[PDB]
Design a protein around this nucleic acid. Structure first.
Ligand SMILES: *C(=O)[C@@H](N)Cc1ccccc1
Lengths: 122, 38, 136, 119
RNA sequence: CGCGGGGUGGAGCAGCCUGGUAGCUCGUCGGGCUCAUAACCCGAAGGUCGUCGGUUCAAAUCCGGCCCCCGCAACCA
RNA sequence: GCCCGGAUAGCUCAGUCGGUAGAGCAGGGGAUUGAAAAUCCCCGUGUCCUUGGUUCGAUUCCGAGUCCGGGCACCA
RNA sequence: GCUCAACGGAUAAAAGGUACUCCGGGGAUAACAGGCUGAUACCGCCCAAGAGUUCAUAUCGACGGCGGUGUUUGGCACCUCGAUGUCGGCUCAUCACAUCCUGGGGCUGAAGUAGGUCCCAAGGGUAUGGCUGUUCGCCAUUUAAAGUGGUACGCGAGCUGG
RNA sequence: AAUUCCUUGUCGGGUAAGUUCCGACCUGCACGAAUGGCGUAAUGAUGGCCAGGCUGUCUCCACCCGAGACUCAGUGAAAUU
RNA sequence: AGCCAGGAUGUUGGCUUAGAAGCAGCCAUCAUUUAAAGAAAGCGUAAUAGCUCACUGGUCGAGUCGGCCUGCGCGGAAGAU
């Protein structure tokens, strides 16, 4: 459950640091994003070296979420903090080249091909 | 097909017919000339 | 377009519009638009009705306008209350009553005139009909 | 001939063109049409206009923005209402003469074709 | 829209209220003085009086309309 | 969209009942200077916005158009 | 002997403020909603000059003409002065169709995808934020779309009080 | 601008987006020098804006604790018409 | 009305346009072959060619046609409990 506002930590490098949801893309009146839903992003902090600078607007896959995720057996993952990897606004595809921390198995898909290939676990 | 209130012929091929209460021009020649209501 | 050059007074009563027209017969020319209606012709309408009519016979042929505006039709401004004087003049209009002949034409084919008018008729408030100069 | 593109009389060398004169009226009355759709509304009424020499073969205009002013008076007397609207008019005449219009990246996109992707 | 003041030589103002007459400073033109230009001295030229149509023996003036200018008013809801 | 006035040289503009069009300035020359500005002088270098029509004849008149200024109406 | 010109002439003799208010009355008379009206607005339609490579009517359509609805501004003063409390926001709504999406069709300057445009249809659906009291609008990013209108410009004996 | 109608003027700053807020411009409808002019540390239950923290204000409301409401016995109003 | 035929010559009419051949436009529109045929009523062509109507023959055998003046009707005609 990510919602508008809601600061997100970023998984990939590219100087993102702190970030804020501005829209949940999907449908009319859509409320929540989690798992690996695509969303809008707007930067706040950012590193000085800057793969991307402060005040940018972007897209991002929600990855880890504090509310966790379920799946068929009733098992439930629940990461301590929300995190998303950035995406190029038109072409999609992560603009980063690394992934920090675990990502969920659920994320797997064609367009999210480049992420799960990276990252230490799951 | 144009509705319009004053139908009338255009092309010589235009026909004028009264199906139901409605009037209707009919040019087999040029399709644009179809018209209802007049 | 087309109004008296001068007037003995500036404004005028609303009047009334009863009775059959005077100049009911053609003379200046051959073909003619007789009225049949009752009403008015603002100085524009006798004009725009003309431009439709001149543009058909083109430069050839001739035309006489039997009627002339000569009646002020005053009006009050936009959203103002009644009665602080008669409103100032806005547009001239010529009353016309049934049988009045509105236009005439000369060196033209009869069939170019039924058309030359029928265009002109569409631009006018009153009903009309084509008519001929007659042997008498 | 050249076909310069004016903006409030500020001729813009960037948009200069060269076309056979018969062609000019269409390239003329078209080039303004891109400008009309991509110059943001301004606080005073605007006048885009393609023209050859001083002669002007085409024009379009952006509209004014304007305060409602009347949204208040509702007694229905008119003279009490022309007073407000008279200022709205008298003052736009001033704002129109100082004018001046920044034109950033517009001297570029679409105006230089690249109005379609990938661009 | 409502009241009231104004349009006069190239410029800024008198003249009008008190129908018969247009004046001031400037500048423009010519001539002087100086090595030459300013200033300076002498002479001169220059005005449908905002248009229109009216009272008139006669209109810058008088009374009506139209054209800009400026000033004041536009209030209780 | 209506109303009134417009479109005349490279630029700012004067003119037309229907009788072979101009001014300042810019430009190009002359005079002057040892030559330079400056100054005086001299040349218009236009199909009278574009397109059709009437007239012996059109920059004026007429038709259609693209435009410029002002005045109303639209213009958070 | 009066320009007592407010000209049948209240005195020989006279101006303003009130949001600090007061009393007697008035729907005889104004501000809101209603009513009649429809100039203004909005919406169609008739005529067809013009634009559309040629091509009046795929698309637009000038001047001029005839209508409809009762959103705006208005008119008149019919109803309420013997206290009816006016925009917007919240909450819950409801009818109209001149339809924003979805659905069915004719024409197209409709190859395809994507459109334009009129006819049919009201079952369901119809965005969150930034600024501002604002409805509106401009901007931000969404969406199948972010419809236009009435309902006392719905809704204060239901809340709010900007 | 506590003053500026036109006006959300125009430029810059902050904001994903800022009719307010901040610094400027000067075309001041209609600032001005003891009906004071321009500054100014401390003070303010004063006006406006921004940020960190904290959260049921909110997305969106769920449960529980007690006093009313509801039923039984005793007493027993009011505006109104 | 239908069905079978002809629908020609001067000649690409004049210009104007790269092209203007019945047909993009402007002015004109006579003359011959005859049953009859417009220098052209549409379609057609880049331009020609090409296909029709107009007018004539043939079969066909009984009314056909377009306006006028009047009676009544039909479209025009969309609203909110
Ligand atoms: C803008 O301020 C207005 N034109 C918009 C509007 C005003 C009042 C009511 C509805 C719209």
């Amino acid at each position: 459950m990510i919602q508008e506002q809601t600061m997100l930590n970023v998984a990939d490098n590219s100087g993102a640091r702190r970030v804020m949801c501005i829209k949940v893309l999907g449908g009319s009146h859509r409320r929540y994003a989690g798992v690996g839903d695509i969303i809008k992003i707007t930067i706040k902090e950012a590193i000085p070296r800057g793969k991307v600078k402060k005040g940018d607007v972007l897209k991002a896959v929600v990855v880890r979420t504090k509310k966790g995720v379920r799946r068929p057996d009733g098992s439930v993952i629940r990461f301590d903090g929300n995190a998303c990897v950035l995406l190029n606004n038109n072409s999609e595809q992560p603009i980063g080249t690394r992934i920090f921390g675990p990502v969920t198995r659920e994320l797997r898909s064609e367009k999210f091909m480049k992420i799960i290939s990276l990252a230490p676990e799951v | 097909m144009k509705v319009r209130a004053s139908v009338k012929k255009l092309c010589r091929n235009c026909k004028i017919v009264k199906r139901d209460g409605v009037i209707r021009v009919i040019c087999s020649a040029e399709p644009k000339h179809k018209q209802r209501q007049g | 377009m087309l109004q008296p050059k001068r007037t003995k007074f500036r404004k005028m009563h609303k009047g009334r519009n009863r009775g059959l027209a005077q100049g009911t017969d053609v003379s200046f020319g051959s073909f003619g638009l007789k009225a049949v209606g009752r009403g008015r012709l603002t100085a524009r309408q006798i004009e725009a009705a003309r431009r439709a009519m001149t543009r058909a016979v083109k430069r050839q042929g001739k035309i006489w306008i039997r009627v002339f505006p000569d009646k002020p039709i005053t009006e009050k401004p936009l959203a103002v209350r009644m009665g602080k004087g008669k409103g100032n003049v806005e547009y001239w209009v010529a009353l016309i009553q049934p049988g009045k002949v509105l236009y005439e034409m000369d060196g033209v084919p009869e069939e170019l005139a039924r058309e030359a008018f029928k265009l002109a008729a569409a631009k006018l408030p009153i009903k009309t009909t084509f008519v001929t100069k007659t042997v008498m | 001939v050249r076909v310069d593109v004016l903006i409030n009389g500020e001729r813009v060398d960037a948009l200069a063109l060269i076309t056979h004169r018969d062609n000019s009226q269409n390239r003329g009355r078209e080039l303004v049409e891109k400008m009309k759709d991509l110059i943001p509304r301004q606080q005073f009424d605007i006048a885009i206009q393609a023209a050859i020499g001083t002669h002007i073969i085409a024009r379009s205009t952006v509209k004014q923005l304007r305060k409602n002013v009347l949204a208040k008076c509702y007694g229905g007397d008119i003279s009490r209402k022309k007073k407000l609207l008279q200022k709205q008019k008298e003052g736009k005449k001033r704002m129109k003469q100082i004018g001046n219009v920044e034109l950033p990246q517009e001297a570029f996109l679409a105006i230089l074709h690249v109005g379609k992707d990938n661009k």
